[PDB]
C-alpha cells in the first residue's frame, strides 16, 4: 500500500573476521568488533522490538567478513526479490544464505547469474516511483539492465558514482518524495543528474555530512512516519537538520564502528512488505 511499508527485515550477524578482513575504502582506525556488535544489536532491536518488524537474523560466516551488509546481495521491490551478483568476487557467496531466507518468506526469486553482470544493492535507490542505479566500481550497466528486466513496472535510470562510493553512501529516501542528500561535490552532482532524468520533482534535504544522508524511512502501522538517522553525538550538524522533520518519528541509531568498513544504516537490512 503506502510507501516505506515493511513487515519483515532480513539481517545477518557479524563475524569476528570483520575487524581485520572486511573491505574498507579509506585508511583509518582499528575496528572494535564488540562495539560493532553492540551497535548492530541496537539496530536490530529498533527494527524488531521498537518497530515490530518480523526479523530473520541470518548467522554469521567467518569466511565472509562483509556478510552483515545484506542490502548489497538482495534488492526487494514489492514481493519480487532480485538476488544480486556483487561486485566484489569475495562477497559472492553471501547470496547463498540470502536465497534460503527469501524463499522461506515465499517471495518471487530472480537470480542475477550472468557472468558479465555485477550489481551491489547499495547502489540501488528506490524512490517509490522509480529506481536510480549507481554505476560504480561494484555495479556495471549489465547488472542495471537485469534489474530493469526484473522490475518492468518501474523506471530504472543510471547515475555515475565517484570512486570508492556507493550511490547510497550519500543519499537515501527520508520520506515520500523526499531524498536526503549530502553536501559534497560528488553527492550534489549526482542529485542533479537524478533530478533531470526523472519525470517528478523530488523534495531535497541537504545534510552537511555525507554518511549521515544514509537514513532508513519506514511507514509503521499505528506509529506513522519513522526515520532512523545517525546520532547527534556522531554528526551534530546533520542531526539538527533531521530534527526539523516534526511529522517523522526520529530514532537516532549509532553506527560509528561499521562506518570504518563503509557500512551505513541501509546496508545492514533488507526490508520486506509481505501482504495477505
Swiss-Prot record:
Q: Which reaction does it catalyse?
A: N(omega),N(omega)-dimethyl-L-arginine + H2O = dimethylamine + L-citrulline; N(omega)-methyl-L-arginine + H2O = L-citrulline + methylamine
User: What's the stated role of this polypeptide?
Assistant: Hydrolyzes N(G),N(G)-dimethyl-L-arginine (ADMA) and N(G)-monomethyl-L-arginine (MMA) which act as inhibitors of NOS. Has therefore a role in the regulation of nitric oxide generation.
Q: What is the lineage of its organism?
A: Eukaryota, Metazoa, Chordata, Craniata, Vertebrata
Q: What is its EC number?
A: 3.5.3.18
What outcome follows a substitution of residue 264 to G? Answer: Reduces enzyme activity about 10-fold, and affinity for asymmetric dimethylarginine about 7-fold
Q: Which InterPro entries match?
A: DDAH-like (IPR033199)
Which domain of life does this protein belong to? Answer: Eukaryota
GO CC list = cytosol; extracellular exosome
Q: Which SUPFAM superfamilies match?
A: Pentein (SSF55909)
Which residues are annotated as active site? 166, 267
The protein here is known as N(G),N(G)-dimethylarginine dimethylaminohydrolase 1
User: Which residues make up the binding site for Zn(2+)?
Assistant: 267
Amino acid at each position: 500500500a503506502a510507501f516505506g511499508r515493511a513487515t519483515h527485515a532480513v539481517v545477518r550477524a557479524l563475524p569476528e573476521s570483520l575487524g581485520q578482513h572486511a573491505l574498507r575504502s579509506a585508511k583509518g582506525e582499528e575496528v572494535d568488533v564488540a562495539r560493532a556488535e553492540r551497535q548492530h544489536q541496537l539496530y536490530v532491536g529498533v527494527l524488531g522490538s521498537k518497530l515490530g518488524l518480523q526479523v530473520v537474523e541470518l548467522p554469521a560466516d567467518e569466511s565472509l567478513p562483509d556478510c552483515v551488509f545484506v542490502e548489497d546481495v538482495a534488492v526487494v521491490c514489492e514481493e519480487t526479490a532480485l538476488i544480486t551478483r556483487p561486485g566484489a568476487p569475495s562477497r559472492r557467496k553471501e547470496v547463498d544464505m540470502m536465497k534460503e531466507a527469501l524463499e522461506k518468506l515465499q517471495l518471487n526469486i530472480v537470480e542475477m547469474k550472468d557472468e558479465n553482470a555485477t550489481l551491489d544493492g547499495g547502489d540501488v535507490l528506490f524512490t517509490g516511483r522509480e529506481f536510480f542505479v549507481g554505476l560504480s566500481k561494484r555495479t556495471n550497466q549489465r547488472g542495471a539492465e537485469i534489474l530493469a528486466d526484473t522490475f518492468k513496472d518501474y523506471a530504472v535510470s543510471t547515475v555515475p558514482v565517484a570512486d570508492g562510493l556507493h550511490l547510497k553512501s550519500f543519499c537515501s529516501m527520508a520520506g515520500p518524495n523526499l531524498i536526503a542528500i549530502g553536501s559534497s561535490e560528488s553527492a550534489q552532482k549526482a542529485l542533479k543528474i537524478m533530478q533531470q532524468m526523472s519525470d517528478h520533482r523530488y523534495d531535497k534535504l541537504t545534510v552537511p555530512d555525507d554518511i549521515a544522508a544514509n537514513c532508513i524511512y519506514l511507514n509503521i502501522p499505528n506509529k506513522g512516519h519513522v526515520l532512523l538517522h545517525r546520532t547527534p553525538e556522531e554528526y551534530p550538524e546533520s542531526a539538527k537538520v533531521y530534527e526539523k522533520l516534526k511529522d517523522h518519528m526520529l530514532i537516532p541509531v549509532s553506527m560509528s564502528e561499521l562506518e570504518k568498513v563503509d557500512g551505513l544504516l541501509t546496508c545492514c537490512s533488507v526490508l520486506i512488505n509481505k501482504k495477505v
